[PDB]
Amino acid sequence: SLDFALSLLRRNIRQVQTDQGHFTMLGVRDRLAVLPRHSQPGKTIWVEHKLVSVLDAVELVDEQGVNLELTLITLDTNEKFRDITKFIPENISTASDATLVINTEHMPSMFVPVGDVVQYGFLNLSGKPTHRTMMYNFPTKAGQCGGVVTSVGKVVGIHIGGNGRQGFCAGLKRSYFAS
């Protein structure tokens, strides 16, 4: 079923470009959105070919101070994202038979069946650590970062990396988005 993923594409998931290239952005509520940290959003970001000022950005770490590979940004806009925090679990959550939802200029409105999303934890890519990751046995590619991992009406992760055969996401929990 594509219905839940589609509802997020319509109201929450946007094509963006930063100085690092093309990414999928997840708007969570109000003016608050999340990107993979390595997208390095600057003082402005291109959202579907519109220049948008970024008011604040925080590169999240866990309590040990280790990178989570997620950056929260506040956009300078009067638009509000429909609040999806209720779909984000309170704890980092594995999932079965997930759909990775990608939306960039190169990969528009894309629904990728990635299979089960399984615990991984501490992951090192390019020599850089990330905590709270999960893995799927699907050959994800460049350009898919920021993709939204969904399963059974839950939003559980953001795509961050891959080795050519498997893919990895940063897990989401609801408290990351609390005010």
Ligand SMILES: *C(=O)[C@H](C[C@@H]1CCNC1=O)NC(=O)[C@H](Cc1ccccc1)NC(=O)c1cc2ccccc2[nH]1
């Ligand atoms: C999204 O931008 C991209 C998606 C990757 C590319 C290959 N397949 C995918 O699914 N992510 C990356 O390129 C990450 C960026 C990153 C993430 C966290 C910390 C630091 C950098 N990097 C990788 O996926 C990556 C690095 C390396 C190095 C050697 C072999 C394979 C690698 N994958």
